[PDB]
Amino acid sequence: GGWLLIQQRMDGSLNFNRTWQDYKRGFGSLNDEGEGEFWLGNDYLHLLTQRGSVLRVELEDWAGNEAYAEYHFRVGSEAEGYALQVSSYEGTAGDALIEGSVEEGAEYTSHNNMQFSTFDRDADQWEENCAEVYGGGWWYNNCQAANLNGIYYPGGSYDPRNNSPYEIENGVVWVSFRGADYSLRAVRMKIRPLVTQ
Amino acid sequence: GGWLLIQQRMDGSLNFNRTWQDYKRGFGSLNDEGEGEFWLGNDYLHLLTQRGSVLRVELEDWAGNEAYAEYHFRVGSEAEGYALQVSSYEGTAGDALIEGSVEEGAEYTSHNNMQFSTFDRDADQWEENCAEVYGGGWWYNNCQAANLNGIYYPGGSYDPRNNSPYEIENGVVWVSFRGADYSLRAVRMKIRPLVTQ
Amino acid sequence: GGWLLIQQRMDGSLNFNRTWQDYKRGFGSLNDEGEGEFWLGNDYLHLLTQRGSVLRVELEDWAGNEAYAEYHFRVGSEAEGYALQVSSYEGTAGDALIEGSVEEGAEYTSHNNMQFSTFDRDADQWEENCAEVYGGGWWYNNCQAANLNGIYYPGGSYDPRNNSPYEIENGVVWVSFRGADYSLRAVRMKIRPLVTQ
Amino acid sequence: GGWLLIQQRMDGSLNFNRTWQDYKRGFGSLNDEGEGEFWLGNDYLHLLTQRGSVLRVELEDWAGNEAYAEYHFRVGSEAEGYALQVSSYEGTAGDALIEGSVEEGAEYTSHNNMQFSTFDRDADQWEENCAEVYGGGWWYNNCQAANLNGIYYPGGSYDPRNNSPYEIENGVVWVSFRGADYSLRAVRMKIRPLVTQ
Ligand SMILES: *[C@@H]1O[C@H](CO)[C@@H](O[C@@H]2O[C@H](CO)[C@@H](O[C@@H]3O[C@H](CO[C@H]4O[C@H](CO)[C@@H](O)[C@H](O)[C@@H]4O[C@@H]4O[C@H](CO)[C@@H](O)[C@H](O)[C@H]4NC(C)=O)[C@@H](O)[C@H](O[C@@H]4O[C@H](CO)[C@@H](O)[C@H](O)[C@@H]4O)[C@@H]3O)[C@H](O)[C@H]2NC(C)=O)[C@H](O)[C@H]1NC(C)=O
Ligand SMILES: *[C@@H]1O[C@H](CO)[C@@H](O[C@@H]2O[C@H](CO)[C@@H](O[C@@H]3O[C@H](CO[C@H]4O[C@H](CO)[C@@H](O)[C@H](O)[C@@H]4O[C@@H]4O[C@H](CO)[C@@H](O)[C@H](O)[C@H]4NC(C)=O)[C@@H](O)[C@H](O[C@H]4O[C@H](CO)[C@@H](O)[C@H](O)[C@@H]4O)[C@@H]3O)[C@H](O)[C@H]2NC(C)=O)[C@H](O)[C@H]1NC(C)=O
Ligand SMILES: *[C@@H]1O[C@H](CO)[C@@H](O[C@@H]2O[C@H](CO)[C@@H](O[C@H]3O[C@H](CO[C@H]4O[C@H](CO)[C@@H](O)[C@H](O)[C@@H]4O[C@@H]4O[C@H](CO)[C@@H](O)[C@H](O)[C@H]4NC(C)=O)[C@@H](O)[C@H](O[C@@H]4O[C@H](CO)[C@@H](O)[C@H](O)[C@@H]4O)[C@@H]3O)[C@H](O)[C@H]2NC(C)=O)[C@H](O)[C@H]1NC(C)=O
Ligand SMILES: [Ca+2]
Ligand SMILES: [Ca+2]
Ligand SMILES: [Ca+2]
Ligand SMILES: [Ca+2]
């Protein structure tokens, strides 16, 4: 396989609500088997995408149904805020990154061309701080249609009115697959850097 | 108008790998603050559930998440193997007693209409002994989607490969809430007279 | 606040490795302040407990920690081997008399319903002689989780590898409080009729 | 297996509430069989860790469960307050050193990059004295998620209400494995210095 892993969630044991510097360097780790929760690190991700790449997102719900989304993908440098560039969607999970959510349209929930934010480095399009409330570092707009770095709620369906400190859909979510009130069981991001050509 | 406690786990201080006699009579104790581990006794459950009842199950993981399930409940007599009869699920934990584990399939993992089995009194649907392997007395099929009388593994996530003497998923489990290789921190079962609600 | 003392250990001055006759009659003495080593006598225990009683057990280790356990207690007649009947545990020492050792299981280490055995009158559940080897008269099963009449080792922790003639865990022990290889510094047993307090 | 032992507890007989000077030189003793309670000494720890090392933590609770944690580890010099630097968690006990306590908050209970403190030498991040209250010398933040040098409470489960002088969770603890209110039975820390390749 020419793919390499850049992110994975599988049991909620790792905290994803971290600082700019943790997202920049990478945290967590994977094993021999390739099991474990982690984030590769925005600085190495910038470097790995220099010559272009294909991103593959794999999702799994609490009943074992699966879906995937593939995109052409680039991550900008730290001066560009690690901005996201994606195009050419293909898959079964639905295009949450370019089109955002059907309920509230692209304008506010599209992720394409957004910078990365964290709770201590806000570069989103909201008057408030998305990352603080949604719980992870991500490419926020105002604020999201998808967030694989959100809070791990076990079981699937969750009632946001039951969350604290914020009564919001801050779970591990991909709207066009299971909706904003459904937190996913296992998720991973993998890229194929187009190193030759 | 209130509930009666019929089982509780919270620290693994009590061994639940017990005989048919221990499960018929009851073992364990609660202190006046309601703490401790126990099993009320199948003879007593048959008695209290004779006109029908509502069962409530309350589950807690090692990160503070909680969920519950409610059913209409009745246990059969001794000569009927204290067989379980449940219906009318409602809740947040997911229905592991009637639909069982969608992934493994209801034919093998549903608990409804199953007799109770212990290691010295096997009436499950497996050619082998479920209670022996899974570690406690329960309403086994072949073998389980849930088991609140399983082995208390401290800390939550466990790897069956490390278990001895059987390398299997025999923790305190409720598959539709936390999966099969996560053992819960605190669990309790409570009932109420059908009339009194 | 009147309890009658029935047993006490505190300085190892008294031999507890004695015959059926001596355990039936009683041996040892107390001073004016309630100090000294002693065993009241099983014939008196049957008599005083005929209508039920509350038993209180007090334990003290060599670092100053203390724990207690309370039970409803009865002893049978001589022809019944002065068998132990206990229920309704309450306390902080853990229930070593009814539930036994969490690790070894209730089947072999439970003391409830056992006969009292001495080296000259073995009625335990072992093919060998528990009382010979564990050093005192007790309500042995196969053989124990608790024994307040075992060997008084100095200082707490001991190594059975170092014991003669039997390399075994035969100290003054209460497994759920301090384990099997820690012998306790002071212990006592006391009773009172249910009515009072 | 090129491991050195650097700490070990097994029955609570050695007092761990000591001075900066005792922690710097080392205290306690081990017999030939590698048995005994002791602390190697921060000055010698700094020397053995100059080229990096692997730290192995081994834990045992009062019902026979065991867990371990491995980290890359280094301890700074005395001028740097013997600061802790760990990375690369793997294991089964959960990462209490880098993630801190999920419930109380990582910010306050994470141990990475903290300095060593003792009751007579406070460099913790609290306005009060962590070492004085929690009972031992340790790499305190405000104050802890783990502390193998805490007060030894017999039996496992303890009630903070019953502690004195202070009513807190100051037992021998590793929160992601057994929680803050359960004191462990046997614990050890061992290193493998990377003398290298
Ligand atoms: C680990 O090991 C360390 C080091 O040994 C321990 O740290 C010490 O813990 C002590 C426990 O909290 C801590 O507190 C001291 O308490 C003293 C009080 O003791 C009695 O007497 C004083 C006054 O006498 C009183 O205030 C206390 O309440 C208590 O009882 C009082 O006693 C007086 C005596 O007549 C009575 O009049 C009062 O009525 C009575 N009151 C009550 C409510 O009972 C303090 O005196 C002591 O202060 C010290 O003494 C002077 C006070 O200014 C000063 O010269 C000293 O520098 C210092 O202030 C203190 O408050 C000790 O201070 C801790 N010592 C150190 C070096 O840190 C840990 O407890 C151990 N950890 C664990 C987990 O076990
Ligand atoms: C609580 O009190 C109980 C009652 O006192 C104690 O129980 C008693 O426990 C002892 C120890 O096991 C038993 O001892 C009996 O006496 C002899 C003990 O064995 C020694 O002696 C024989 C032969 O003499 C020998 O083969 C053994 O090897 C051993 O020592 C040997 O001694 C010889 C010299 O004789 C020497 O040359 C050898 O080198 C040496 N061996 C070694 C390795 O050094 C046995 O002979 C006894 O066997 C039977 O014989 C007698 C009856 O005819 C009688 O002694 C025994 O009852 C037995 O039938 C036996 O070993 C006692 O049997 C036992 N008594 C009872 C009533 O149970 C108990 O120990 C104590 N508990 C605690 C914790 O302190
Ligand atoms: C991902 O992690 C981040 C990094 O940790 C977490 O973000 C952090 O989130 C906290 C919590 O929301 C931010 O602090 C907030 O709380 C304080 C106080 O909270 C409580 O008190 C205040 C009033 O004191 C209330 O506004 C809150 O609702 C809470 O309830 C109150 O509690 C009081 C006790 O303090 C009590 O007396 C009062 O009655 C009670 N009221 C109610 C209704 O319960 C807020 O004060 C704080 O606002 C701050 O104001 C300061 C100046 O006033 C500023 O300096 C602070 O920066 C901030 O503006 C804020 O609402 C914390 O700021 C934030 N940290 C960062 C770096 O962003 C994040 O939550 C995690 N997300 C998930 C999903 O986990
Ligand atoms: Ca903003
Ligand atoms: Ca079978
Ligand atoms: Ca026998
Ligand atoms: Ca301080």
Swiss-Prot record, chains A, B, C, D:
The alpha chain is normally not N-glycosylated, even though glycosylation at Asn-17 was observed when a fragment of the protein was expressed in insect cells. It is well known that heterologous expression of isolated domains can lead to adventitious protein modifications. Besides, glycosylation at Asn-17 is supported by large-scale glycoproteomics studies, but the evidence is still quite tenuous. Most likely, Asn-17 is not glycosylated in the healthy human body, or only with low efficiency. Residues 1-195 form the Fibrinogen C-terminal domain. Glycans are attached at residue 17. Detected in blood plasma (at protein level). It is linked to Congenital afibrinogenemia: Rare autosomal recessive disorder is characterized by bleeding that varies from mild to severe and by complete absence or extremely low levels of plasma and platelet fibrinogen. Heterohexamer; disulfide linked. Contains 2 sets of 3 non-identical chains (alpha, beta and gamma). The 2 heterotrimers are in head to head conformation with the N-termini in a small central domain. A long coiled coil structure formed by 3 polypeptide chains connects the central nodule to the C-terminal domains (distal nodules). The long C-terminal ends of the alpha chains fold back, contributing a fourth strand to the coiled coil structure. This is Fibrinogen alpha chain. It comes from Homo sapiens (Human). The lineage of its organism: Eukaryota, Metazoa, Chordata, Craniata, Vertebrata. The chain holds residues 670 to 866 of 866 of the full protein.
